[PDB]
Every structure is written in C-alpha cells, then in structure tokens.
From a paper:
The neuronal RhoGEF Kalirin, a central regulator of cytoskeletal dynamics, contains a Sec14 domain (KalbSec14) followed by multiple spectrin-like repeats and catalytic domains. The N-terminal CRAL_TRIO domain of Kalirin is followed by nine SRs and a variable number of RhoGEF (consisting of DH and PH domains), SH3 and protein kinase domains. Kal7, the major isoform expressed in the adult brain, supports the formation and function of excitatory synapses. KalbSec14 adopts a closed conformation, sealing off the canonical ligand entry site, and instead employs a surface groove to bind a limited set of lysophospholipids.
We obtained diffraction-quality crystals of KalbSec14, a construct consisting of the Ex1B front peptide (residues 1–25), the putative CRAL-TRIO domain (residues 26–182) and a part of the predicted A-helix (residues 183–192) of the first SR. The X-ray crystal structure of KalbSec14 was determined at 1.89-Å resolution by single-wavelength anomalous dispersion using a selenomethionine derivative and refined to an R factor of 19.5% and an Rfree value of 21.8%. The asymmetric unit contains eight nearly identical protein monomers, with an overall root mean square deviation (rmsd) of 0.8 Å for 175 Cα atoms. Unexpectedly, KalbSec14 has only several small, discontinuous hydrophobic pockets (~100 Å3 each) in the center of its αβα fold, none of which is large enough to accommodate even a single phospholipid molecule. Moreover, the 310 helix H7, along with an extended loop, is positioned across any potential openings into these internal pockets, mimicking the closed conformation of the so-called mobile gate as often observed for holo-forms of other Sec14 proteins. Nevertheless, an elongated groove is present on the surface of KalbSec14, directly above the S2 and S3 strands. Our NMR CSP data and mutagenesis studies demonstrate that the residues lining a distinct surface groove of the Kalirin Sec14 domain are responsible for its interaction with selected detergents and LPC lipids.
Numbering used by the authors: 19 to 65, 68 to 133, 146 to 192
The structure:
C-alpha cells in the first residue's frame, strides 16, 4: 500500500491506450447500439488463448465509461455469445463483470449454444435477442444491421 496500487480501476482514468492489446483482441466491445429501453449494449462475441484477469478487469472498466452518463444511467444490456462455447468459459466473464464492472448491468443475455449474479441473466436464442434489442442495434454476429468497425473505433478512441 506504499508502492503498489491495488483494487478497482474505476478512478484510474483508464484510456484506450491503457487497454490497447486486449481491445485489439476484441474480447468485448461497445458498438454504440442501444437496447429498446435506451440502455447501452456491451457485447462479448464468440472467442482459445487464456487472457489475464487484470487485463479483462481493465477492459470492462474502460468500456463502462464509453456511453454518455445519461445512457449509462439506464444500465447496460450485456450480450454474451455462448454459441460454440461452454458454461465454464462464460461464468468467469459474468464473475469479472460482477466484481469489476463500475456501472449497472440491467440484464446479461447469453446466446445459448445459471442465475447466481447481482444482475439478471437470461439464456436466449439469437432470435430471442430481437425481443429486447431492435435488429438495427445489433451487430452482424447476431443477424443485425448495425455497422460497427472495431479497428476504426479503437483509432478514434486513441485520438481522445
């Protein structure tokens, strides 16, 4: 406590440059898409290289700060694509969000290939997503029409 910083990254003023390697890996992204309530969408697309827990905590802390304060106030819709994956590879993402995500999670929607978290979780089909999110607000992976270029987004964030 005299040399090393420990605990939450909430007040560390993380920038895209602080999380650049994991941003490039596209473990998670904030497309700009909004759910039907007006809340922001945080996406974890289909992943096998093990990631460092601290890198994931920094990533979700940074991504929580991406939407405007008013949009964030409605809480996030988290979309996790589990198609071609397993529960043992999804549960650690939910645990890290519960421990490190500095904003409210309204609901975590898991695309089916249970509910012991502080936020609501729902096992849904890629079509069941459209009940809570308009397809114009969903990216390509979920048969949506929202244009989102992750590499371009990173370059614009680095210019902030």
């Amino acid at each position: 406590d005299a040399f090393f910083r420990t605990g939450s990254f909430r007040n560390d003023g993380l920038k895209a440059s602080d999380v650049l390697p994991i941003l490039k890996e596209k473990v998670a992204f904030v497309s700009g898409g909004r759910d039907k309530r007006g809340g922001p969408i945080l996406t974890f697309p289909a992943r096998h290289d093990r990631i460092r827990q601290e890198d994931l905590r920094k990533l979700v802390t940074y991504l929580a700060s991406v939407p405007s304060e008013d949009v964030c106030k409605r809480g996030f819709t988290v979309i996790i694509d589990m198609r071609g994956s397993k529960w043992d590879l999804i549960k650690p993402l939910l645990k890290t969000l519960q421990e490190a995500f500095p904003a409210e999670i309204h609901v975590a929607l898991i695309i089916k290939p249970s509910s012991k978290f502080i936020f609501e979780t729902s096992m849904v089909s890629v079509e069941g997503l459209t009940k809570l999110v308009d397809p114009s607000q969903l990216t390509e992976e979920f048969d949506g029409s929202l244009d989102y270029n992750h590499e371009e987004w990173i370059e614009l964030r680095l210019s902030l």
